[PDB]
Structures are given as structure tokens and as C-alpha cells.
Ligand binder design. Structure first.
Ligand SMILES: CC[C@@H](Cc1ccc(OC)c(C(=O)NCc2ccc(Oc3ccc(F)cc3)c(F)c2)c1)C(=O)O
Ligand SMILES: CC[C@@H](Cc1ccc(OC)c(C(=O)NCc2ccc(Oc3ccc(F)cc3)c(F)c2)c1)C(=O)O
Lengths: 265, 265
């Protein structure tokens, strides 16, 4: 249908406009300001001086390397939450929802969306960082002392299977919209209206996948399962973040992320 | 032993990573995107339009319902063969085997592994389908016209007895590894090395069952018998598939499955 084809394009266009990184751009960079490779402590410190020089300009008062990385990961998340919040406006009916419901949907959806979209900048060897200007290796992230190493690898595990689906940005934009419009989030005021909004996006996603991936007759239920997988990934992530908060006094939580996690799971 | 305890954990972790469905996840779903129930032709057609819409988008050129189900079963098998192939890498010595021997082990092992793992998504009333998003009833599958109904019920019969053993994913991962590392498959090049690889996994499986199931002193020989039962189940399955291929011109065999069955039994 023309209105459904146009809805899929409106959401794709809103995705290309609001996210600084997309999968086409990421794949160009990942093929080879070429990305500076962070693969050990020496190169982490070099990258810091060029790409986040403010963070390491304190001398002996700088934080432990694992804590600096954790801070930079949170800063990345904060930026993606801002992009996700503006993206959400192109989802039909989202801006027509109660202001409090918009908050609840974004609260439970953003980290599912973050980990889905992280896959676009990940390969089996590492991931893009710092607006495409660095590449940090998966082995280096695994090498961080506990518990900071444990933040990283489950996200690569998710991403490698997600990337094997060979989605493109036109698919992922609709998937991220579908994540944001979940009617079963806790605390929603107008569940009925959200379910109808969800049904419309999921309807467009199913038709789009049929059209864009005729080779994979199971792709739509595969992506439904990935949404469930992402919910569990986020629950587990929040638990690990809580461990870091209680046992690592130097790893301050950004206040915006603090409020996202507050009363989440 | 720490190296044997770690081997059992390495195989369990490889199982949790490589299979989209596991028994914990399946049991959560089976307790009640909740699964759409396929219990008759009306609901089969509804599920098709939502979960495999490409297959029924041909109008009067669609296949008979039994043939569409057969195709969707083959597609499920093809996906599980892919997961099984990547799982096999965590079995110690498997990646060190001759490339041709890896092929032979997977050739004779995958359907034994498929039917063992199908049990995790089966109960006495039906089974999960389509990445956890559908539940098709055992009575509906029995209702299919011959010979397609005869594909289904022997697998439920096997599964109900297998499930009564109350294995968990830590057991099943080792059992599936033991299935893949059978040294008596036809055509093997380095039988001696495979037998030693088998002995190591079977050794770990025996110790694991002692530790995880202290209430069942016969559990290890019970599972040895289930491996033999699965071999016979596969021989019988291949015979029925051959009948369908010869007598049902609309039931095309997927080429990957065609090669698995080629010169099997
Ligand atoms: C705190 C956890 C998050 C969720 C989370 C979980 C996993 C992740 O990746 C697997 C990521 C993430 O953003 N990875 C990209 C990234 C990696 C390292 C970085 O560190 C540097 C440091 C110096 C440099 F010069 C360049 C990069 C960085 F800045 C971004 C985020 C949250 O709870 O919000
Ligand atoms: C061809 C035989 C196989 C071996 C075999 C034998 C027995 C089985 O189950 C007892 C299964 C199997 O996979 N059962 C799950 C399943 C069931 C129905 C499905 O049909 C639909 C249709 C429409 C839907 F919307 C959802 C599901 C489906 F997709 C998957 C497989 C092969 O020789 O490879």
C-alpha cells in the first residue's frame, strides 16, 4: 500500500536524519581521518589525548583506565538517547501520545534500541567509537578488569547473530520504531492507543521485510525474538551496572542514565 | 576436575550462544508477543499471513497446506543445521579434525541432534514454532493427510520420554556434543582421533550427570540408549522423507537437506 510504503520511508528518513551513525556509513569506515585503533593501554591513552583530551588532562588525578572507558561508554549512550528521542517523533501517533507515556516508552526502549543499533558499528574484531574516529578491539575490551569487561562481550554476542540477519538501515529503522512502541511497558497510561500505534509499525515492518528480504521467510519472527532477546540483554545489563555502582566508587553514573535505570527492572 | 568442569561449561556456554531456542526460554514461553496457537486450518492460515507471509502470497498458486507445513519444517531444520555447525567448534578437537571428517560427523549427527533438541520446545499438547512466536498443536499435526502426519508423531513420542528425564540445558549441550562426536559414523578418515575426542566428551557427560542428577543412578546409560533410539528415529525419518519425495511432486526438498540425506542410510 502507498500509505504503508510511505510510512516505512518516513521512518527510514527520520532514522537517516537523526542518527549520526548508520550502517552504510559504518561499513564504509570499517572497510578502511581513518579510524585510530585502540587495542591496548598505550593506544587507549593515545586515543584519549586526541579524541577526548579533556578526560585525561588531570595528571595523576585521572581515573583508572576501566573507569575512563566506562565514562566514555555512558557519554555515547547519552548522545544516542538524545538521537532516539528526536527520532521517536516520526513514529505515527507517538507525538500524539500523552507526554508521560512518551517518557515511559523511551525509558524502557532506549537501551534495547542502543544495543540493537550498536551492532551496526560492530564486527567480530571490535567496534567503532567516537563518532567513527576510533576502532576499539573486542579483545582489548575483554582484557579490562572485572567487572568492566563483563559489560562488553554480551553485546558483541548479540550483535554477531543480529548482523548475520543482514538487515539494512531501512529494516533497522522500523525495528527501532517497533522497539520504542511496545505497549507492554510498565506504567503506561493509554495502553490501548499504544498497542494500536505498535500494531501499525509492526504491520509496516512485516510487509517491509517481505519486500526487502524475500529470501528469508522467517525474518519477521526472527526479529520478534530479537526484541525479546534485547529485553533480557537490558535486564542483565542493568544488573551489571548496579554491581559497578555499588562496588566501584569512582564509576559515577551520568544523571540522565541514572533516571533511565531508576525503577526500570 | 577443574579442566573437566571447565569443558562442560565451555560446551554449555557455546550451546547458549549458538542456539536461538533453549529449554529455559522455551519453558517460559510454554507457560504463558505471546505465541499464536495453530490448532486448525483457519489458524494455520492466519499464522502464515503473520509469521511467513511470503509463503502464502501467491494466491491460488499457493501449495496444499500439508506441503507448506513440510516446507516450513525444512526451513526450521536448515536453520538448526547452521546453529549446530557453529556449536560444533567448541567441542575440543573438533576444529582440529580433518575438514572432511567434520563434514561426516555433522552429516550423520545433525538430525539426531535436531530431534533431541526439538524435545525442549515440545509438550504433550504441541510445540513451539517460528522462533517462539507460534505454538502448533500435536492434534493438528496428527490431522494432516498422510504421509505428512506420519512425520510428526514419532518425534513427540520420543520427546515425551526424553523430557521425563528432566534434563537441563547443561545436560543437553553435552548430549548434543556427544551425538556429534560419534566415531562409528560411515566414511570417517581419522576414526582413532574421533574416538578419543568422543571419549573426552562422554567422560565429561558422565561426570556432569553424576553431579547434576544425583537422584538418577542410571541416567548416563539411559542417555546412551537415547542416542541409539535417535539413530533409529533418524533412519525411519529418512525413509519417510524418501516416500514423500517420490510420491509428492509438490514437496521440494531443500538442497542442504538433500545433501545431508544423500547416501546417509
Ligand atoms: C557504560 C555502559 C553503557 C552501555 C554500553 C554497553 C556496551 C558498549 O559497547 C560494547 C557500549 C558502547 O558505547 N560502546 C562503544 C564505546 C566503547 C568504548 C569507549 O571508550 C572510549 C574511550 C576512549 C576513546 F578515545 C574512545 C572510546 C567508548 F567511548 C564507546 C555501551 C551504558 O550503560 O550506558
Ligand atoms: C520436513 C521434516 C523435517 C524434520 C522435522 C520433523 C518433525 C518436526 O516437528 C514434529 C519438525 C519441526 O521442525 N517442527 C516444528 C515446526 C512445525 C510446523 C511448522 O510449520 C509452520 C507453518 C506455518 C507457521 F506459521 C508456523 C509453522 C514449522 F515451521 C516448524 C521437523 C526435516 O526433515 O528436516
Amino acid at each position: 500500500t502507498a500509505d504503508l510504503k510511505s510510512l516505512a520511508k518516513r521512518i527510514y528518513e527520520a532514522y537517516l536524519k537523526n542518527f549520526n551513525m548508520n550502517k552504510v556509513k559504518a561499513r564504509v569506515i570499517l572497510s578502511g581521518n581513518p579510524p585510530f585503533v585502540i587495542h591496548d593501554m598505550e593506544t587507549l591513552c593515545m586515543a584519549e589525548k586526541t579524541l577526548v583530551a579533556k578526560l585525561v588532562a588531570n595528571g595523576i588525578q585521572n581515573k583508572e583506565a576501566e573507569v575512563r572507558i566506562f565514562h566514555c561508554c555512558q557519554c555515547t549512550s547519552v548522545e544516542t538517547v538524545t538521537e532516539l528521542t528526536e527520532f521517536a517523533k516520526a513514529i505515527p501517533g507517538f507525538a500524539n501520545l500523552d507526554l508521560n507515556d512518551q517518557v515511559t516508552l523511551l525509558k524502557y526502549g532506549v537501551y534495547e534500541a542502543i544495543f540493537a543499533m550498536l551492532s551496526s558499528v560492530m564486527n567480530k574484531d571490535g567496534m567503532l567509537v567516537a563518532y567513527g574516529n576510533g576502532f576499539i578491539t573486542r579483545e582489548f575490551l575483554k582484557s579490562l578488569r572485572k567487572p568492566f569487561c563483563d559489560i562488553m562481550e554480551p553485546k558483541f554476542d548479540f550483535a554477531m547473530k543480529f548482523n548475520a540477519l543482514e538487515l539494512d538501515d531501512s529494516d533497522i529503522s522500523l525495528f527501532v520504531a517497533a522497539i520504542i512502541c511496545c505497549g507492554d511497558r510498565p506504567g503506561l497510561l493509554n495502553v490501548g492507543h499504544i498497542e494500536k500505534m505498535q500494531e501499525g509499525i509492526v504491520h509496516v515492518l512485516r510487509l517491509h521485510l517481505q519486500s526487502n528480504h524475500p529470501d528469508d521467510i522467517f525474518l519477521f519472527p526472527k526479529l520478534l525474538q530479537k526484541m525479546a532477546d534485547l529485553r533480557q540483554l537490558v535486564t542483565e545489563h542493568a544488573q551489571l551496572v548496579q554491581i559497578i555502582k555499588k562496588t566501584e566508587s569512582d564509576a559515577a553514573l551520568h544523571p540522565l542514565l541514572q533516571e533511565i535505570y531508576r525503577d526500570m527492572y
